[PDB]
């Protein structure tokens, strides 16, 4: 849109060994005001697909319902074809770039995570259409404050496992609540790998005041 | 851009016990060339020479105030002002007009007046300093002069070595700079001599 | 930011929230936003950090040279006077509210609001950007005759509401309660803080 | 960028400089700035090197498929005409296009300037581009319609060599061509440096 | 830029990078952005690289002559309160953004100063355009009374984090680390960076360059 | 648009402009001169803003003169030239700048001929030949193209001529006279005024 | 709302007697931030053709998927794959197509042309194109391109023997400069690489660049 | 202006204030903000006037049709998703919010916020420009679990301190009921209205 | 600026323009003709923008030619000047207005000669004598001291030369040239062509 | 506003129209635009009447009071310097103030021409306001040095006259003066209704 009203902000994409996991808070921002505290910004596309995404919540609930309707438009097939991450990705790069090509962008930066034919596959998608894929992701404040701490632990150990990419990403959640203004300490963590995709949440991240008495 | 009105570029080069001071001699209106012979680098001492890039009129004041202040520094204290010394007059100089300064970005280029030790800095037009090792460029053409010079320049480098380099270094960038050319002055400073030379140079 | 400051029969109670931000940065979640001017006098700053802490730093010098002078621990209406100068002479440059609350021997605990050059003395003040998402709050829940106790309570309660909706606001909340005895800081930490309806 | 043309007595001297540029980088030195519609037609450019590039190849197919179609070689007059048009239809969207068109058809020889204002004058002698008017000194002081082949191969290459001597934007190599009765002749392809310092000795 | 500060058990750490650069060209490969102020007082800087250079130099003049005067150990505290009486002054027209820390009488002590004039007193901070990615690593790590070496440890993965992610920052680390006794300014801490080996080659002789003309002058 | 022009020869300086006061429109004044003379040899063509092209001479005329009378002997060409450019630049960054385009020229004993370049912003250059305005455009290369160091004046006339007859066939501006002067070890002559 | 965004990215391509050479950095950047550090920017276009794209990223993904339907289009139409001289003069067009909200892309084509010689197009965002020898383009062309003059067109220098510019040498030369640009453009970075264009096919090589 | 709606076992509460303004001049001061969509269903108009009463008069129209071809009347999440449609389709044009309330035999009574053309449901929403005065108040007191009864206080006490607060709103307060049984409407008089702290 | 004149006299029409095509500040012609045909008795000069002038006078001239193709006979003077006033305000508040001053001169059997003014938001006017561009300003009061309703031809020809004359003298731009032409009962005649 | 000034064998003539206004309003028909300054002195007003009238008058009280202190009446050269330097002073602070200084002093008749931008120029005759580029027409093509006395008042009452009929903004009543040697005279003031008419018979 134009002027973005409701937004999500930050969303975290990390990739394990045999699967993605994705995280994002439960606010819907008006402005500086935390407005709508409880609206989920992940979204599961089909068996092997999730999106995650921030900015404007009324643009991801249309794209939301075009996806929702294409995911099933596929199944009535009943064909044996199934569209896969990358596909998904593919897609919406080409939305968000035609939108943006007629002066009239989707007002949201997304993550793709998915598991398909035992190969994890992590997708960015802005609204300019610039997309890409990557070990880890973090939009919005989570690339100045969440990527920095992803790209460190994987710059040591390229393959984590499960356990290990959870830890990381309810450690990346801390932090974000902690230096940006437009979070909410109540996020929902997304996974996907073989056995589908699976939303926990509302999980909440332990926050230390200590330094208020130094 | 007030800095790209005249055009011009300059650039300074260490080598081992040796120091090259380079300028363009183009002095244009915008557009339009009106002389090929302006000068650029001016002496600021033996063995201390100050390439100044930017708006023409800037280059001459921030040149004629830089001398009145060298020469009362020279006659108060009796001595020839080291290399070091001297840009921190230029900053300070160019520091004085911090809201309202002077369109020029200086190269400094000369051997302390005792010890002959290279020396090479530049600075900004608000007068922040930057003393490297290797080599210092600035004016319209800074990109080009960078490329040439990170690949180019070699450390310990003999006289006839540096100049060739910054020769080559200077010919290729402003040769990429639609104004910046008509010919190139080259000074190289020794302990024992300076040698300046006007390099076969592109006239368009 | 989200400030406030309540009156009761023998003192003040002032609170407030410490983050400092920039834009949608968090520069500082600790931050203290309670200054005392004097002995029995504080303020808290709301704003322009640079404008509250200039003012509040003027005003804390203008009053230390006035009690000496005077050889007396200075009014609270003096140090508010002191302020309401300062913001109005620079009511254009300035931007900040620098509320202030304390008690002395005269006229017991007083709060004095002087957002912009404008002095009001009254029995209790919200300010900052969070200050907005409270003014129903505290004006159903505020009754004359609150002890020290409730004071700090309502403040609490007031400031961790303002906290959660304001995206300028949050951290920890500052305590702090005036009276003749003397100052006792008092920190709420997240944690601790009072917990309301956050679905 | 610099581009001249003027009509003697022995046919029609055209002339370009080869520089390009993006603000003050020189991206090019070796840019073609006279496209060859067909033998005995020519069209210079200056200006957007895009738009020149584009409106002038389109120029060239219709004057292409006239020939088809007509079963004939279209005049110059027509060529600038169509060009003129072709270029009158954006008008105020800010394309960029300065060109001469150089042949000659059975009117004798033809020389057209066209711009993208829809500009479209027939004349002895032209110059566009931003080194233009150096080029116009040059050429008109030394200009004489009685001028031998020799004689009218010096003032473009003195021309162009001058004007890229004084404008910042323009330079190169200077490309000339020679317009006769029996079609185009490519004439040089001097670079101007080695030209200038001759013109200094 | 990134620079960063932390208040370890027995003192603070100071830490920077070494990239000056023009927009978003390279100028400086290794500029010193830790400045002293005095003996036990360090300062970084961030923002405009001339106000910065000129805040710090001209507070250090002003420490000194206080120092002698008094004839003591200047404070931290009047540091940070002459430093933004100046910037507040100037209403934030002097691009300074400044990391101070030393260790006077009083103890350990770290402040933000910002151009219009605030400052932070904190147990740790981060300044510059690559000062998220530190305060991430500072956030995910800190822990209150450090020991010497796990402070410096900590700073240097700061510092380190916005060499990385921040593309106005790069080259290497330096960090300065004050106690009560000494003072330890490690200009290159670490060199996590470097250029190629140089795979092929270009040189050119003892005449390559066409000259023109020349002027031999001897000293 | 007002047009100068310098030439400056092995033991001369030969120096033009056009005569026309323009308002608007309309040519109120057709034998306007252009040129100041500073001292016996020195002659400062102005233009520009109107007003400050007058004002701005004016001053460094009068105090070329305090100079010649406060200590006997005038002021060089070369130090005139940098005087001026001094002046110029002082006001440049005050509350009133002088928006004028100069050429000094002038004559030394020991020193020659010479002749000064000087654009609004105080740019001071020394050359063999210059010119002002937008007839600098199309006149410019005619003396790159003709120009020698050993030019005698007769053949200078000629040159200048040249550029002039440009002006009057291609420039869209009507400058039908210019005013011609020169300077040599005799001081400064007036030469027969070019029309057309 | 800007529909631009400046992704970084330098492309260089080379043209030798039986080869053609097209090498980027694989840096993505946005702002003072970078997307990723695995980010190529020449793409296979036919068996001798590669292009090499720069600018802003949304528009390189989108060119690069329309020259690529194109190429198809016309090997069902013609019975033949593209040349490299016909697919320059068809991008050419394509980009002039958006000549009033135009890609933002820096184009250098790199291929083998009919004779079987090195080929290189060099290309403006709005289609204005030329064949050249030897080409840089993107965030850091303007440090790069004066080297190639001094060092493959040996622009500037006397008495030099003007020998032609062997494989080994020109792969050596696109590793220099392009580390000399990891130097000094913030945008240039992380890794290199190179694809060699020739008879025998396309081959590709990755060579580490500065991660800062 | 300032709106309300609430979920209660068994139905809804949408209440909202009477004040329509054209900047600082009451130009209506009884307008009724809640405009029935269906028999069951209604619906709390913000923003500006034009745009609400053309939207909310198109969808009862859609709605209408809509219940007749199915022959059973329309859900409350039909009715908000109509809403939401309209609403984010001409979101660059249109500039009001229109809070869905209402009940329906499959999912009882249920509140939907439409705002923008992003649909959600709460347990209670409020609108309007005098909302963010009562953002504190509401998370404060709002309690599950409450009946009917306790719902129309609720309402009524919010909207209340809203009113004295908010210049845009004022007047009286219009209180609507929806349960199975049907429509109660109320009206609550500038002199029965809640007192709080208005000093 | 482009200057056009016309003066009508007992039996004819006499009408002039300068010769003039510039680009910014280049002459790039002084052959320009700003006159043309529409029919036997019938001229039409045009200035202003360019483009605009050319293509919305070759439009008309293209038009008048093919009403006296369909009909047999040509379009008269007065019919002419209104036909060109309705295209041009047609055009007035579309996408693509032509920006062009216009001048209608022609000769009518039964109506006698006439001279229209049209400026480019299309107001038709007849008149006496008119003027079009900057030249106007300083030459219709010329044109009102002189003129006489019976002025003979001869007389004309010596009017227009004076109001040349001062544009020579008082006119900033360069107009060395003007095309003169006039329209009576035996069409249209080329006169000789006015220079300075 | 119409002024025009021209010297010839027996003195300078100036003359002027007398419309004021404000906007298309016509303020007044009998303004005056010249200042007599002295007996052999004269100023015409054009622009900015409350500049005009303010400047001029100043003008005028320091030629009072140089007389007073030189014992000698102020040349017209040096006035009109004085005028010149006072409004540069002021420039580019929106003054507008066209004038022309007239008298005749030690040098003969002097005629200068001065304006609100600083420029001040003597010459042979002049014409400001917005009805000059009228005056001048007719002016330029009826003056000839050796005109009669009889002869330069009736071109100067047509070169007003006109450019009353053309220029909206000028008309009323034409004021006449004649500077001669032993000073200046008031010749007429003939309204140019009158005039006119009669010029159409």
């Given at each position: 849109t134009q002027n973005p009203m409701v937004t999500g902000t930050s969303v975290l994409g990390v990739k394990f060994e045999g699967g993605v996991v994705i995280a994002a808070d439960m606010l819907g921002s008006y402005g500086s005001l935390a407005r709508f505290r409880n609206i989920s910004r992940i979204m599961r596309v089909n068996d092997s697909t999730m999106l995650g995404a921030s900015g404007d919540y009324a643009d991801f609930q249309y794209l939301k319902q075009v996806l929702g309707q294409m995911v099933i438009d596929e199944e009535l097939?009943?064909?044996?074809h199934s569209y896969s991450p990358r596909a998904i990705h593919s897609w919406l790069t080409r939305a968000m770039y035609s939108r943006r090509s007629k002066m009239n962008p989707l007002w949201n930066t997304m993550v793709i995570g998915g598991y398909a034919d035992g190969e994890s596959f992590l997708g960015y998608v802005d609204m300019l259409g610039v997309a890409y894929e990557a070990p880890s992701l973090a939009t919005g404040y989570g690339a100045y404050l969440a990527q920095p701490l992803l790209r460190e632990v994987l710059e040591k150990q390229p393959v984590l496992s499960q356990t290990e990419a959870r830890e990381l990403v309810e450690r990346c959640m801390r932090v974000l609540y902690y230096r940006?203004?437009?979070?909410?300490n109540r996020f929902q963590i997304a996974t996907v790998t073989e056995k589908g995709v699976e939303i926990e949440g509302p999980l909440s991240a332990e926050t230390n005041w200590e330094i208020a008495h130094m | 851009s007030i800095m790209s009105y005249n055009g011009g570029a300059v650039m300074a080069m260490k080598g081992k016990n040796c120091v090259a001071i380079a300028a363009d001699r183009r002095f244009g209106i915008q557009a339009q060339m009106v002389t090929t012979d302006f000068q650029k680098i001016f002496p600021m001492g033996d063995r201390l020479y100050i390439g100044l890039a930017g708006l023409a009129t800037d280059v001459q004041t921030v040149a004629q105030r830089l001398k009145f202040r060298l020469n009362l520094y020279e006659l108060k204290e009796g001595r020839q002002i080291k290399p070091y010394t001297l840009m921190s007059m230029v900053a300070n100089l160019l520091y004085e007009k911090r809201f309202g300064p002077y369109y020029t970005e200086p190269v400094i280029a000369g051997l302390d007046p005792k010890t002959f030790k290279p020396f090479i800095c530049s600075l900004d037009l608000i007068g922040c300093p930057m003393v490297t090792d290797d080599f210092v460029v600035s004016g319209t053409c800074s990109e080009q002069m960078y490329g040439m010079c990170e690949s180019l320049w070699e450390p310990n480098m003999d006289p006839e070595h540096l100049f060739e380099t910054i020769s080559q270094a200077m010919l290729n960038a402003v040769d990429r700079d639609?104004?910046?050319?008509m010919g190139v002055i080259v000074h190289i400073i020794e302990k024992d001599k300076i040698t300046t030379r006007t390099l076969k140079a592109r006239m368009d | 930011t989200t400030i406030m400051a309540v009156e009761f029969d023998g003192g003040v109670v002032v609170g407030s929230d410490s983050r400092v931000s920039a834009g949608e940065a968090?520069?500082?979640?600790?931050?203290?936003?309670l200054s005392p001017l004097h002995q029995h006098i504080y303020c808290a700053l709301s704003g322009s950090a640079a404008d509250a802490q200039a003012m509040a730093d003027m005003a804390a010098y203008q009053l230390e040279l006035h009690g000496l002078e005077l050889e007396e621990p200075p009014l609270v209406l003096a140090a508010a006077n002191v302020v309401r100068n300062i913001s109005y002479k620079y009511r254009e440059d300035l931007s900040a509210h620098l509320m202030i609350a304390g008690w002395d021997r005269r006229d017991g605990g007083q709060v004095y609001g002087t957002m912009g050059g404008m002095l009001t003395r009254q029995p209790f003040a919200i300010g900052g950007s969070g200050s907005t998402y409270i003014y129903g709050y505290v004006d159903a829940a505020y009754k004359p005759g609150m002890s020290p106790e409730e004071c700090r309570s309502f403040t609490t309660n007031a400031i961790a509401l303002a906290m959660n909706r304001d995206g300028s606001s949050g951290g920890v909340i500052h305590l702090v309660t005036i009276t003749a005895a003397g100052v006792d800081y008092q920190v709420i930490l997240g944690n601790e803080l009072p917990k309301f309806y956050d679905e | 960028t610099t581009t001249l043309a003027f009509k003697f007595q022995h046919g029609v001297i055209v002339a370009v400089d080869s520089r390009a540029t993006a603000g003050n980088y020189?991206?090019?030195?070796?840019?073609?700035?006279?496209?060859?519609?067909?033998?005995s037609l020519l069209g210079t450019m200056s200006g957007c090197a895009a738009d020149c590039q584009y409106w002038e190849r389109l120029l060239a197919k219709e004057c292409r498929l006239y020939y088809l179609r007509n079963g004939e070689r279209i005049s110059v007059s027509a060529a600038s005409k169509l060009l003129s048009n072709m270029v009158y239809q954006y008008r105020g969207m800010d394309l960029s296009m300065g060109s001469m068109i150089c042949g000659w058809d059975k009117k004798g020889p033809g020389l057209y300037y066209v711009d993208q204002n829809g500009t479209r004058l027939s004349g002895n002698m032209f110059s566009t581009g931003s080194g233009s008017t150096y080029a116009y000194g040059v050429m008109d002081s030394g200009y004489?319609?009685?001028?031998?082949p020799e004689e009218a191969y010096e003032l473009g290459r003195r021309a162009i060599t001058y004007a890229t001597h004084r404008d910042s934007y323009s330079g190169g190599i200077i490309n000339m061509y020679h317009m006769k009765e029996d079609g185009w002749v490519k004439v040089e392809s001097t670079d101007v440096n080695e030209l200038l310092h001759q013109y200094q000795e | 830029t990134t620079i960063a500060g932390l208040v370890f058990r027995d003192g603070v750490i100071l830490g920077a990078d070494t990239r000056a650069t023009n927009d978003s060209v390279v100028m400086d490969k290794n500029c010193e952005k830790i400045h002293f102020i005095a003996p036990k007082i360090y300062c970084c800087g961030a923002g405009v690289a001339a106000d910065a250079e000129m805040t710090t130099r001209m507070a250090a003049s002003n420490m000194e002559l206080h120092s002698l005067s008094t004839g003591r150990e200047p404070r931290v505290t009047t540091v940070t309160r002459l430093l933004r009486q100046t910037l507040f002054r100037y209403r934030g027209h002097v691009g300074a953004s400044l990391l101070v820390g030393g260790v006077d009488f009083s103890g350990p002590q770290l402040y933000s100063v910002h151009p219009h004039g605030s400052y932070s007193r904190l147990p740790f901070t981060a300044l510059g355009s690559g000062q998220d990615a530190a305060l991430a690593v500072l956030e995910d790590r800190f822990q209150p009374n450090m020991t010497l070496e796990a402070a410096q440890e900590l700073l240097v993965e700061a510092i380190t984090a916005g060499i990385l992610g921040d593309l106005g920052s790069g080259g290497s680390v330096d960090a300065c680390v004050i106690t009560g006794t000494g003072a330890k300014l490690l200009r290159t801490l670490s060199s996590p960076t470097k250029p190629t080996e140089r795979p092929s080659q270009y040189y050119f002789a003892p005449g390559t360059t066409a000259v023109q003309s020349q002027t031999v002058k001897p000293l | 648009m007002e047009y100068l022009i310098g030439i400056q020869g092995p033991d001369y300086v030969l120096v033009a402009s056009d005569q026309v006061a323009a308002s608007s429109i309309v040519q109120m004044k057709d034998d306007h001169d252009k040129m100041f003379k500073m001292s016996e040899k020195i002659l400062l063509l102005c233009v520009g803003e109107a007003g400050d092209t007058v004002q701005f001479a004016e001053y460094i005329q009068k105090n070329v003169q305090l100079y010649k009378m406060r200590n006997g002997y005038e002021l060089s060409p070369t130090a005139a030239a940098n005087f001026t450019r001094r002046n110029l630049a002082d006001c440049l960054r005050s509350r009133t700048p002088y928006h004028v385009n100069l050429l000094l020229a002038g004559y030394d004993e020991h020193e020659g001929p010479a002749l000064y370049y000087m654009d609004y912003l105080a740019a001071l250059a020394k050359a063999p030949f210059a010119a002002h305005g937008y007839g600098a455009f199309l006149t410019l290369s005619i003396l790159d193209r003709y120009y020698t160091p050993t030019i005698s004046r007769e053949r200078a006339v000629e040159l200048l001529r040249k550029c002039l007859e440009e002006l009057q066939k291609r420039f869209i501006l009507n400058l039908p006279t210019f005013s011609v002067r020169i300077i040599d070890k005799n001081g400064i002559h007036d030469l027969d005024n070019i029309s057309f | 709302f800007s529909p631009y965004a400046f992704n970084g990215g330098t492309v260089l391509a080379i043209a030798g007697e039986d080869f053609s050479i097209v090498a980027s950095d694989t840096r993505l950047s946005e702002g003072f931030s970078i997307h990723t550090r695995d980010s190529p920017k020449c793409y296979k276009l036919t068996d001798k053709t590669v292009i090499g794209c720069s600018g802003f990223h949304g528009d390189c993904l989108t060119l690069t998927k329309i020259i690529e339907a194109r190429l198809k289009m016309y090997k069902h139409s013609n019975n033949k794959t593209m040349t490299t001289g016909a697919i320059a003069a068809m991008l050419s067009t394509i980009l002039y197509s958006r000549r009033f909200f135009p890609y933002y892309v820096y184009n250098i084509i790199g291929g083998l042309d009919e004779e079987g010689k090195g080929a290189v197009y060099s290309f403006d965002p709005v289609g204005s194109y030329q064949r050249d020898s030897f080409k840089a383009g993107g965030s850091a062309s303007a440090m790069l391109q004066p080297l190639l003059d001094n060092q493959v067109g040996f622009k500037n220098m006397q008495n030099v023997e003007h020998v032609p510019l062997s494989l080994d040498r020109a792969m050596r030369l696109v590793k220099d400069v392009f580390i000399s640009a990891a130097e000094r453009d913030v945008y240039t970075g992380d890794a290199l690489r190179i694809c060699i264009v020739t008879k025998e096919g396309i081959r590709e090589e990755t060579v580490p660049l500065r991660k800062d």
């Open positions: 097939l009943g064909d044996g940006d203004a437009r979070s909410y | 639609a104004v910046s050319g | 968090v520069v500082n979640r600790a931050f203290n936003k | 020189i991206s090019s030195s070796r840019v073609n700035k006279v496209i060859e519609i067909n033998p004489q319609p009685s001028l031998s | - | - | -």
